[PDB]
Design an enzyme around this catalytic site. Structure first.
Site, short mmCIF file in Angstrom:
data_model
loop_
_atom_site.label_atom_id
_atom_site.label_comp_id
_atom_site.label_asym_id
_atom_site.label_seq_id
_atom_site.Cartn_x
_atom_site.Cartn_y
_atom_site.Cartn_z
N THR A 1 40.03 -0.03 11.58
CA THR A 1 39.20 -1.13 10.72
C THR A 1 40.12 -0.48 9.20
OG1 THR A 1 37.77 -2.26 11.95
CG2 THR A 1 37.28 -1.45 9.92
N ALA B 1 31.31 -4.32 14.81
CA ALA B 1 31.26 -6.06 14.38
C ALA B 1 30.25 -6.75 14.46
CB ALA B 1 31.88 -6.73 15.46
#
Lengths: 244, 212, 238, 232, 222, 204, 195, 246, 229
Positions: B1, B49
């Site tokens: 990420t 998320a």
């Protein structure tokens, strides 16, 4: 007795106390909304009790979404709570479905808060202690029914309309709408129509400080007009009636 | 990420990736990791998320609500600290966040605020978070300037993600490029990493240690 | 009529408890607001009950809620006192949330909000206090003047007067004032306030109190000497 | 006297509650609706009112669920609570027992809801009467709801404004519509006839008629407009 | 103490076409080393061109579907027969997942359906909250096996024209609704051979705008 | 260290004939860091003196809490609380929060103006009356103090001999206590007046 | 945060605050304050765990500000310090504990005397002319006795404070990358630029 | 006006307070006389039937061993309020102070229970005015009257109830600044015999003292350091003794 | 969170063309000690459903009291509710299904594995499974605990799938279930020679067969061996 109760019925079968609340709605300023197949035009009268009153920093047409607007009359005090609740409902819908709220459905939520009168009655837990002295003209556009105008009544429930007047001048305004309306109207026509009826039911002079239009046109969104725009339409009107 | 945003004289660039893992296998490569709060603000999904997705759509609802109330425009400072106060209430419950709120008002300019799930709020001009945060930092700092072309800022926002894909194992997917101007954000499309690799590889004569 | 209770409506559609609440406002000291272009001046009558009354520790009729919004009142002094404190907890709290100081537009809603709430309910009486809230925004430098009333309805006015023979000051104001050109100098705008307040005191220059808000968190309370010079200009010309 | 209204918590000397009877009055003043049934269908036909000719009528049939539905007569805010309450129960039945709610058990739950306002100080007994139809596992049923809370099964009934004219139609033609089964059109047609007779100083319009139907192989369906124009 | 969680197998797959979308799933049910069931559809009609399959933990799956059907009816009542779009459903499922986050659900959900441009749509969900638009994503135990095979026949990823050697590469092509089905039948059958929680029978529901049809195909019980 | 006494501090109370004394060290510590040289352990309300040992945050918190409790009494009865009565007041404050409890060892000292009689008391964490009138010690040097005091203790010393006896006990103990070593203040308490005398001693 | 100091001199109070904000293995920003005014002549620096620091500073800020407006008169530093101690000692028995440690300097305008009050996380008010938490106090307390005098000018206090930064820098792994030096005087609160 | 606890009168005061006062006056006569080493408290008993046990009525009830009471007003109100008084005395002032509370302090708690029963409308205050006498080691022997108006007053000699007005002048005349307990006990009976005659006798007049410590009533021994009950109830036989020597 | 104290063994089930046979052991073990015998574990609910309960006896009682109270609830109101609004195994299942989730979400479960078997009043077989995890599934052969891996393969020979149901009749079904009890007696530590067996048929109604004894003993392979070490 029947009228000094709050959940006490009269021998005709009318909740008198609740009946009396309709005359609260009327005391306020006239607003006349007219639905068209191009959009809804909402006009108001705003009272000036002084030149010193800033009539143009106060409004009674309010934004609820980006395609939902509301006209109101009655207690701006009760209009603050009624409009605040309705804003919450639009936004929480938007939260839940990422989709436009239908005009009617926003109206069901405004009528739910209205139901509440009680201190013992069941359905929902009653926390609000009197009727609301305030009405709405609810305007929007969903695409699966088109442009629509609904009227919220705090003493009743949601009525579909092609045009409604509420306020002091309601009764006489309504006749004129029975007389002049058409399904053959454009929004351009429709705007000069709100103004032509409004002035006759006005006791204050027809000027821009005591007036204010807005529209729900899906394309343009909820748009409150200018004072410069509203002054134009007063002239165009004056030209029309001289010709006529 | 790998997420980042950086400030310049022209506005704000936000650039993100699209690869996210569960195990050591990739769930999705089409992940959108900028979530469009409202037309005036953009914030980024990074960290966990589920929490980011849920609480940024909540924050745009709040933003829409405040704009209806006040008959105004949301501030970047107003939006950001509504999120930090929420996350603080929920903290101590697995909550994770990495988001930077990007917004350009006329009354305060472009501003960026980092928010964490610990309720940490940091004003700054430069932020990169993630686990590829280190790699992209390398790239970001040394090419950063205040005085900088729009064209070449959009070039930097591709380059941070591009390096980062090769070295981090969890970053890749595609590049998403966004520019927040005073009139709202404007999208600059999606660019697949692979196709971008050969062009840049040629352009600067970099990545000559990367062959295979 | 239907003043036996608050929740019951009225054939006449006017909740009596609110109407009588207004009537109570006329008890208290006159307060007047006049906006400039670079100023708002917020003045109030400070009526002296006896000569044993301190000026050492005795409350002024004008109260700052926060460091750039100013508030006067007219009404039941008892009631005003909790209304001003409630206004203030929220006001400060506004910064807790946003890390922005208090906006005048958010503030009028709030003051109208505590009041609206009390009226809606049945097991409380309304506040018998109408307030004037003057101030500027933090973000901007255009002068803003608001009113709250008992009812829970709020307005903006260019200049507005409330309490103690409010009518007579209101008319006075119309004639003097110009909306085309509001005074753009702080001094001349002050002078308009003094002339108003003169009327309700009949005689006093130690019973007229003037306060001014200026932009960028300037709030000042005017010297008793400084007001007397303005009275001196007004008596000579007359 | 009549000082034994003013409270819904005081019995009169005669042993009535005036307050519940005054709820029965509120019904008559609102619109008329007719219930009738067969053994394969239950059908409701309702006179809809408008307030002016820019107004587009008011809906008086609410779909409860796909095998239940009701009409209202009397106050419209009172109606909304009960049609919402009724739906909670139908959803509950689907969630907890995977079972269609039975009309008879529905009605006794509605009875309860009412007696809750009757005992309590505060509140009112509901100002609306509902005519409830469903088709469950034991076939079609039709109940008549009142403010007192009494639910009564009937082959045919009517409540509301000038409802004696419809009840007269119904009496005479009771057996004719009971015996018809399998033809949805005939029960639809019969209900049309009844509500014509109910009217005084009015005529039927394509937007007065509302038709609501449930059966053996008929889902809940609400007809209005040009859907009641085959059977005008 | 107690593990309120478990794993009860299956494998599911979503495909977005461009006029259709499918949701497939095997009809095996496992609890550890027991084969519970030889046939039990994991893929459930919800009406309104929405198929929903929530697979993982069978307790969380079947209650998550149940709660959804109650929500669908309440949307009909408060919006007077409004359509629920696939993205409107997609957000509704966000708050059902996030609504216990302190005792969360434990299912990977895929809904497949039809968008308002009238093309395939699939949104697949992360098990605790969050969704993204997908085109091929598979959930469950053998998701690993089934997914990259379809990112080569459907997606055309890391493929390139003959003799050109990367210069240009091969474009996506329009698809028939049948052809998509054969790709799904192969993938499942290969996953029966290479894995222990797949087989028994394969249900593929195809969402078209003519309704939600069902097509069932026998599959290997070993 | 230990979780109930990381920040240390020592208090020692003795009885003489119609006199009490109480004394304490002035070092505050936080682990191994000596923080402040001036910071008293002992506080007073009217004519009753109290030292409170322990985790330093709770010494400060009960100083304030007891002042609130004492002063409510004084104003209402129009008269001072007595050091007999005051004992059972500490015992209830400490026991109210048995779960998550105050970490202190308070020691009272004081002389009645209705008997002219010295009263000393000790309490633990959730409080107890330890109603010996031998001598009462608490703090991190609790172990150290019980022996040093015992050795010296002759009952019924004259007040000025009692000042010699408690100052000496305290000073030896402090050098050999890790979490106190700096400063001292000794209260010599009598009916008539209360003399406070700081020592001069070594720092570490 | 990663360095926090306090030294109190003849007519001013001097506080130093870390620029660096260390979050995991990356320093996300190298030039941020870690001090907020309580009042125009009372300044609170903060250090401790991230996230606790930021919401706590602002919450305390709201309260001291609210009192200042109420009485229309500013609370004395002595008052202020006891308020900040009370919140910490309550929190240590509450659901969510803080790890925010503070030094609050004030030029008391009623006793016309500079005062520095060190307050730790657990909740201990101590009046002290020095002050520091973390492992910054474990270097600079020793150092401070010799080079301090019973009084010196604010200029000589500035140089004295620079000497403690130099001691820390050499011997502590933690980066802070310079310090903001704020002075608290009788005429407001100002920033002096210092390396 | 008079007629809610909520409504203030034009000249003020609540009327419910005045009416509750009326109730007391319909009561029996109780009276207290402060001596220099005691307080004697005395009242009579009536019950209508003579078939009634008189030793079952509670009207001389010790709240604590240090502090006795009597009432005039409602009989039911007494038992309930004595019960409540005791309960509060240990919670606020025996778990904290460590001993049974001061005469002044305990009188304030009693007034505070009344006061709560005035604030809450639709809830009447207690029908009783009590006399509460006690001893403490600070303020000495003490005597109070605590009215159903929720206010208490200290007194030297006082009487309450129906016969109050007749008793008070006897008290003015016969009180002297220095008395013994035994001259007070005889003055107490003498005055109380004005209240009724034809029925006054040592088994139907209930009289008690709060005098000197008695270790006889302590019930545990070999502890010299505490005192014993100040309170002493005199038996029926004692009351007859004193009535003969008078 | 409840921990097993007193527990039963297992239930075995199959379908035939016109009914179901549900049968289960009768044991109440506390660990190794076979504490209780004669713990009857089939409970009839209504008249067309037999519910077999394994897992806790602690929790069996609570469930017993609940389902008896289910018939009480059904029987309130309705002049017909025995051929028109009776309980059917679909209803009965869904009740218990909903509680099991509910108690799991309180983090405090009712520890049981339950099998609900019956014929509907539309003539359609219902045999569906629920347990403490809240896991639910239907399969032509169901079995619980040990008997799930252990005694289910036999029954799965007789009825493998949906299409083998009209070809299995009642007699075949009946031999399978008894045959399965013989494995469970032999070769599961927790077992009982007594077992209760109920035959539910749509055409004959409810038949209860009480204390059927394991038979067709074999043990003549234990005399073959002499063992070794």
């Amino acid at each position: 007795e029947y009228d000094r109760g709050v959940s006490t019925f009269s021998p005709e079968g009318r909740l008198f106390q609740v009946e009396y609340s309709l005359e609260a709605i009327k005391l306020g300023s006239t607003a006349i909304g007219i639905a068209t197949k191009e959009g809804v035009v909402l006009g108001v009268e705003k009272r000036a009790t002084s030149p010193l009153l800033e009539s143009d920093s106060i409004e009674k047409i309010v934004e609820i979404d980006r395609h939902i607007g509301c006209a109101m009359s009655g207690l701006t005090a009760d209009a603050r709570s009624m409009i605040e609740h309705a804003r919450t409902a639009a936004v929480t819908h938007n939260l839940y479905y990422d989709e436009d709220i239908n005009v009617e459905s926003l109206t069901q939520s405004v009528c739910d808060l209205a139901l509440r009168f009680g201190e013992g009655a069941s359905g929902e837990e009653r926390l609000m202690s009197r009727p609301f002295g305030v009405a709405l003209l609810i305007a929007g556009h969903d695409a699966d029914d088109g442009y629509q105008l609904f009227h919220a009544e705090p003493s009743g429930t949601f009525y579909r309309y092609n045009a409604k007047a509420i306020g002091s001048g309601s009764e006489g305004a309504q006749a004129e709408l029975l007389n002049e309306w058409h399904s053959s109207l454009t929004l351009k026509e429709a705007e000069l129509l709100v103004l032509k009826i409004l002035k006759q039911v006005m006791e204050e002079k027809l000027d821009e400080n005591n007036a204010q239009l807005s529209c729900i046109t899906k394309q343009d969104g909820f748009k409150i007009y200018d004072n410069e725009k509203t002054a134009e339409l007063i002239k165009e009107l004056k030209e029309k009636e001289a010709a006529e | 990420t790998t997420t980042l945003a950086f400030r310049f004289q022209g506005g704000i660039i936000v650039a993100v990736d699209s690869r996210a893992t569960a195990g050591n296998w990739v769930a999705s490569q089409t992940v959108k990791k900028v979530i469009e709060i409202n037309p005036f603000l953009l914030g980024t999904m990074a960290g966990g998320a589920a929490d980011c997705q849920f609480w940024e759509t909540w924050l745009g609802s709040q933003c829409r609500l405040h704009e209806l109330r006040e008959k105004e425009r949301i501030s970047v400072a107003a939006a950001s600290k509504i999120l930090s106060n929420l996350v603080y209430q929920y903290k101590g419950a697995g909550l994770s966040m990495g988001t930077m709120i990007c917004g350009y008002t006329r009354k305060e300019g472009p501003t960026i605020y980092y928010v964490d799930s610990d309720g940490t709020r940091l004003k700054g001009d430069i932020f990169c978070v993630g686990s590829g945060q280190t790699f992209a930092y390398g790239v970001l700092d040394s090419n950063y300037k205040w005085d900088l072309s729009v064209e070449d800022a959009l070039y930097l926002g591709k380059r941070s993600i591009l390096a980062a894909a090769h070295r981090d194992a969890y970053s890749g997917g595609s590049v998403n490029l966004y520019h927040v101007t005073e009139d709202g954000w404007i999208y600059h499309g999606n660019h697949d990493v692979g196709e971008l690799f050969w062009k840049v590889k040629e352009e600067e004569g970099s990545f000559n240690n990367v062959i295979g | 009529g239907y003043d036996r209770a608050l929740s019951i409506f009225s054939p006449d559609g006017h909740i009596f408890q609110v109407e009588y609440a207004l009537e109570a406002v006329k008890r208290g000291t006159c307060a007047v607001g006049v906006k400039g272009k670079n100023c708002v001046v917020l003045g109030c009558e400070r009526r002296s009950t006896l000569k044993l009354q301190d000026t050492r520790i005795t409350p002024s009729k004008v109260s700052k809620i926060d460091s750039h919004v100013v508030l006067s009142f007219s009404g039941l002094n008892a009631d005003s006192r909790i209304l001003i404190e409630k206004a203030r907890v929220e006001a400060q709290s506004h910064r807790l949330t946003l890390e922005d100081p208090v906006t005048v537009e958010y503030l009028t809603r709030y003051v109208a909000g505590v009041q609206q709430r009390y009226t809606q309910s049945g097991g409380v009486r309304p506040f018998g206090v109408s307030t004037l809230i003057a101030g500027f925004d933090p973000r901007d430098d255009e002068p803003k003047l608001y009113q709250t009333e008992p009812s829970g309805i709020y307005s903006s006015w260019s200049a507005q007067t409330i309490g103690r023979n409010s009518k007579t000051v209101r008319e006075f104001l119309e004639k003097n004032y110009d909306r085309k050109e509001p005074p753009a100098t702080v001094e001349e705008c002050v002078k308009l306030t003094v002339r108003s307040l003169l009327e309700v005191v009949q005689t006093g220059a130690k019973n007229i109190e003037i306060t001014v808000v200026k932009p960028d968190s300037d709030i000042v309370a005017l010297s008793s000497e400084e007001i007397n010079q303005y009275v001196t200009q007004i008596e000579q010309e007359k | 006297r009549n000082n034994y209204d003013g409270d819904t918590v005081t019995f009169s000397p005669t042993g009535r509650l005036f307050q519940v009877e005054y709820a029965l009055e509120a019904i008559k003043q609102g619109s008329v609706t007719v219930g009738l049934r067969s053994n394969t269908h239950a059908v409701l036909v309702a006179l809809k009112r408008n307030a002016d000719e820019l107004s587009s009528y008011q809906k008086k049939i609410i779909k409860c669920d796909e095998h239940m539905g009701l009409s209202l007569a009397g106050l419209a805010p009172d109606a909304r609570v009960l049609s919402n309450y009724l739906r909670q129960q139908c959803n509950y039945s689907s969630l907890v027992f995977n079972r269609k709610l039975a009309v008879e058990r529905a009605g006794h739950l509605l009875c309860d809801k009412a007696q809750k306002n009757t005992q309590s100080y505060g509140g009112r007994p509901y100002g609306v009467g509902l005519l409830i139809i469903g088709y469950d596992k034991s076939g079609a049923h039709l109940l008549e709801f009142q403010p007192s809370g009494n639910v009564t099964e009937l082959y045919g009934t009517a409540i509301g404004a000038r409802s004696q004219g419809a009840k007269t139609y119904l009496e005479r033609t009771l057996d004719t519509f009971i015996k018809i089964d399998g033809n949805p059109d005939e029960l639809i047609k019969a209900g049309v006839e009844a509500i014509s007779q109910s009217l005084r100083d009015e005529s039927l319009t394509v937007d007065n008629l509302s038709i609501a139907i449930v059966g053996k192989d008929t889902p809940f369906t609400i007809y209005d407009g040009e859907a009641v124009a085959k059977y005008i | 103490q107690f593990n309120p969680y478990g794993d009860n197998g299956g494998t599911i797959l979503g495909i977005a076409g461009e006029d259709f979308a499918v949701l497939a799933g095997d009809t095996r049910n496992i609890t550890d080393y027991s084969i519970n069931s030889r046939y039990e559809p994991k893929v459930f009609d919800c009406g309104d061109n929405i198929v929903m399959s929530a697979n993982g933990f069978a307790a969380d799956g079947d209650a998550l579907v149940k709660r959804f059907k109650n929500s669908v009816k309440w949307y009909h009542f408060d919006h007077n027969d409004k359509k629920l779009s696939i993205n409107s459903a997609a957000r509704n499922i966000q708050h059902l997942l996030y609504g216990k986050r302190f005792f969360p659900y434990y299912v990977h959900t895929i809904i497949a359906g039809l968008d308002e441009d009238g093309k395939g749509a699939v949104y697949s969900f992360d098990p605790v909250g969050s969704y993204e638009r997908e085109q091929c994503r598979a959930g469950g135990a053998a998701a690993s096996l089934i997914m990259p095979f379809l990112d080569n026949q459907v997606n055309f990823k890391n493929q390139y024209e003959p003799g050109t050697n990367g210069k240009v590469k091969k474009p996506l092509k329009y698809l028939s609704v049948e052809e998509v089905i054969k790709l799904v039948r192969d993938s499942f059958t290969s996953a029966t051979e290479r894995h222990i929680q797949v087989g028994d029978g394969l249900e593929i529901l195809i969402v078209t705008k003519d309704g939600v049809r069902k097509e069932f195909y026998e599959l290997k019980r070993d | 260290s230990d979780p109930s006494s990381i920040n240390g501090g020592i208090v020692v109370a003795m009885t003489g004939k119609d006199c009490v004394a109480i004394a304490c060290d002035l070092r505050l510590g936080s682990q191994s860091l000596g923080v402040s040289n001036k910071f008293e352990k002992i506080f007073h309300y009217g004519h009753v003196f109290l030292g409170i040992t322990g985790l330093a945050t709770d010494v400060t918190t009960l100083n304030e809490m007891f002042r609130y409790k004492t002063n409510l009494y004084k104003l209402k009865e129009e008269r001072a609380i007595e050091p007999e009565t005051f004992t059972q007041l500490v015992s209830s404050s400490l026991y109210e929060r048995r779960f998550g409890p105050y970490f202190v060892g308070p020691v009272v000292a004081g002389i009645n103006s209705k008997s002219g009689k010295p009263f000393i008391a000790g309490f633990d964490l959730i409080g107890c009356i330890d109603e010996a009138k031998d001598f009462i010690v608490s703090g991190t040097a609790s172990d150290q103090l019980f022996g040093m005091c015992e050795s010296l203790y002759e009952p019924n010393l004259e007040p000025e001999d009692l000042f010699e006896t408690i100052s000496q006990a305290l000073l030896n103990a402090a050098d050999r206590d890790a979490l106190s070593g700096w400063g001292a203040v000794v209260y010599i308490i009598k009916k008539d007046e209360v003399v406070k005398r700081y020592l001069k001693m070594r720092q570490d | 945060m990663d360095i926090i100091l306090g030294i109190r001199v003849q007519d001013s109070v001097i506080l130093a605050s870390s620029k660096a904000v260390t979050r995991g293995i990356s320093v996300l920003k190298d030039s941020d304050d870690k001090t907020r005014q309580l009042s125009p002549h009372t300044l609170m620096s903060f250090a401790g765990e991230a996230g606790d620091t930021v919401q706590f500073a602002e919450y305390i800020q709201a309260n001291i500000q609210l009192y200042s407006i109420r009485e229309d008169y500013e609370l004395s530093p002595q008052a202020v310090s006891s308020f900040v101690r009370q919140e910490l000692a309550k929190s240590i028995r509450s659901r969510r504990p803080y790890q925010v440690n503070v030094l609050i300097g004030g030029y008391d305008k009623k006793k016309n005397k500079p005062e520095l009050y060190q307050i730790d996380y657990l909740g201990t008010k101590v009046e002290l002319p020095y002050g520091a938490h973390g492992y910054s106090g474990f270097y600079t307390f020793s150092l401070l006795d010799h080079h301090y005098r019973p009084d010196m000018t604010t200029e000589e206090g500035l140089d004295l404070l620079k000497l403690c930064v130099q001691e820390l820098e050499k011997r502590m792994p933690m980066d802070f990358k310079g310090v903001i030096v704020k002075i608290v005087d009788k005429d407001g609160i100002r920033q002096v630029d210092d390396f | 006006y008079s007629f809610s606890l909520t409504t203030f009168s034009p000249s003020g005061k609540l009327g419910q307070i005045d009416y509750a006062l009326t109730a007391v006056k319909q009561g029996v006569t109780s009276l207290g006389i402060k001596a220099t080493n005691g307080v004697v408290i005395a009242t009579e008993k009536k019950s209508s039937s003579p078939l009634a046990m008189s030793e079952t009525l509670s009207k001389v009830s010790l709240l604590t061993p240090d502090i006795g009471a009597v009432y005039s007003g409602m009989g039911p109100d007494y038992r309930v309020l004595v019960d409540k008084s005791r309960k509060v005395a240990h919670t606020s002032y025996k778990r904290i102070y460590g001993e049974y509370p001061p005469t002044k302090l305990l009188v304030s708690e009693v007034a505070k229970i009344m006061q709560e029963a005035t604030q809450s409308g639709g809830v009447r205050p207690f029908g009783v005015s009590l006399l509460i006498a006690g001893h403490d080691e600070f303020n000495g022997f003490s005597l109070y009257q605590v009215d159903p108006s929720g206010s208490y007053f200290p007194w030297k000699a006082t009487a309450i109830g129906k016969g109050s007005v007749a008793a008070k002048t006897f008290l003015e005349k016969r009180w002297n600044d220095e008395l013994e307990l035994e001259d007070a006990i005889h003055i107490a009976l003498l005055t109380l015999k004005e209240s009724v005659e034809g029925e006054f006798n040592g088994d139907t007049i209930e009289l008690a003292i709060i005098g000197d410590e008695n270790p006889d009533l302590l019930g545990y021994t070999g502890i010299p350091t505490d005192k014993g009950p100040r309170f002493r109830k005199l038996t029926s036989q004692e009351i007859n003794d004193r009535l003969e020597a008078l | 969170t409840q921990q097993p104290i007193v527990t039963g063994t297992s239930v075995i089930s199959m379908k035939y063309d016109n009914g179901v046979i549900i049968a289960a052991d009768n044991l109440g073990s506390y660990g190794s000690l076979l504490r209780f015998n004669g713990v009857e574990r089939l409970i009839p609910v209504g008249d067309n459903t037999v519910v077999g309960i394994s897992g806790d006896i602690s929790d069996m009682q609570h469930i017993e009291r609940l389902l008896k109270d289910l018939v009480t609830e059904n029987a309130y109101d309705n002049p017909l509710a025995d051929a028109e609004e009776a309980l059917e195994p679909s209803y009965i299942f869904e009740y218990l299904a909903t509680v099991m989730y509910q108690r799991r979400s309180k983090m405090n479960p009712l520890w049981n594995a339950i099998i609900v078997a019956g014929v509907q009043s539309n003539g359609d077989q219902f045999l569906r499974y629920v347990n403490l995890l809240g896991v639910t599934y239907s399969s032509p052969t169901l079995a619980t605990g040990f008997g799930a891996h252990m005694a289910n393969p036999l029954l799965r020979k007789v009825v493998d799938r949906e299409s083998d149901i009209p070809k299995t009749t009642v007699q075949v079904a009946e031999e399978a279930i008894v045959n399965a009890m013989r494995v469970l007696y032999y070769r599961d530590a927790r077992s009982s020679r007594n077992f209760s067996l109920a035959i539910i048929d749509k055409n004959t109604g409810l038949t209860f067969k009480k204390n059927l004894q394991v038979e067709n003993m074999k043990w003549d392979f234990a005399k073959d061996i002499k063992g070794y070490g």
